[PDB]
Structures are given as structure tokens and as C-alpha cells.
Ligand binder design. Structure first.
Ligand SMILES: O=C(Cc1c[nH]c2ccc(Br)cc12)NO
Ligand SMILES: [Zn+2]
Length: 168
């Protein structure tokens, strides 16, 4: 199925919505997962949360590999443990062309359901751990800019809106 999902941009208030847990991993949820990967890859991202495409369910897709063949699905993820501190200049498909250093845990341990509905546990570090935290934030209506000063958040909003006016 060819995805028709649309990635929301700030300051759309639906990006602040808190997603509900998935009740059952069935064929419909699998189609959402597969469409989210297609949209992620088309937009040249490494992660996507359902909130970013106006689906208010706890679903994340991630692929941090160069060859785009390492598909991680997190349904109803739970953070079990974290340690250390790090940060990179993160970007976000919903905050186009803006980047900023964000504090993150260096290592995380999560549990989630996979695309088949099977529970699994994953220990991650590095970029993958940062991306898991970023995407889980989306599901509770949080964006990377929320960690910056209020002035910097205002400048980010203004730049995205200008970019979005220019389009069309
Ligand atoms: O839209 C996205 C994915 C994404 C795009 N560029 C990024 C840079 C760093 C991190 Br972490 C995540 C991303 N997240 O919701
Ligand atoms: Zn994002």
C-alpha cells in the first residue's frame, strides 16, 4: 500500500496531543506501521512517531541504518532504565531545517511490542538511544525544541512558519 500520510509541522497543535496505547496489534495497525516507514524513508528521516502523522496511537518506526534495512517498530513502548548523558544537534521532520543540541540519556532499556504484537526488550546506546527518546517524546506531545530557552523556541517557530509560507 502506497502511503498517503502527511507529516505535521509546528505550530500545529496536534503535535502536542498525547497518544493512546494500541489496543490490539492487528492488520490495520500493521498497515499504519508500513505506511509510516514509507513516509519516513520518503522524507529521509530516521524515525517517525504516529503523532507526527495525525495518528494518536503509541506507534513509532525507526531506522538508523545507512542502507535503510534495519526496521525497528515500537508499539506501546515503555522506558525501563536509562543511564548517562549525551546530546547531538537533533533535527525533526516536524521542525524542518532546524537543529539544536538536546540533553538525552546515553543508554536506554525499553520494552515494546513489535509489528507482530510480540513483546521484546531492547538495550540501545548512541544515536539509536537518542532517536528512541526523541520519538517517545513525540507520543507525549513533546518536541526537541521544548528543551531550549523560550526565546530559542520562538525563533524556531518563526523560521519554520517562514519556510512553510514560502512553500506554495
Ligand atoms: O522526524 C523525526 C526524525 C528525525 C529527523 N531528523 C532527525 C535528527 C535527529 C533525530 Br534524534 C531524529 C530525527 N523525528 O520525529
Ligand atoms: Zn521528531
Amino acid at each position: 500500500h502506497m502511503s498517503v500520510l502527511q507529516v505535521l509541522h509546528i505550530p500545529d497543535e496536534r503535535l502536542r496531543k498525547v497518544a493512546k496505547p494500541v489496543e490490539e496489534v492487528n492488520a490495520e495497525i500493521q498497515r499504519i506501521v508500513d505506511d509510516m516507514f514509507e513516509t519516513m524513508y520518503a522524507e529521509e528521516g530516521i524515525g517517525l512517531a504516529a503523532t507526527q502523522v495525525d495518528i494518536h496511537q503509541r506507534i513509532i518506526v525507526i531506522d538508523v541504518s545507512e542502507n535503510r534495512d534495519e526496521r525497528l517498530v515500537l508499539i506501546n513502548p515503555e522506558l525501563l532504565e536509562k543511564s548517562g548523558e549525551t546530546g547531538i544537534e537533533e533535527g525533526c521532520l516536524s521542525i524542518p531545517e532546524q537543529r539544536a543540541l538536546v540533553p538525552r540519556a546515553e543508554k536506554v532499556k525499553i520494552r515494546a511490542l513489535d509489528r507482530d504484537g510480540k513483546p521484546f526488550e531492547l538495550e540501545a546506546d548512541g544515536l539509536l538511544a537518542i532517536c528512541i527518546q526523541h520519538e517517545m517524546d513525540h507520543l507525549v506531545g513533546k518536541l526537541f525544541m521544548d528543551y531550549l530557552s523560550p526565546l530559542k523556541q520562538q525563533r524556531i517557530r518563526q523560521k519554520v512558519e517562514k519556510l512553510d509560507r514560502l512553500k506554495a
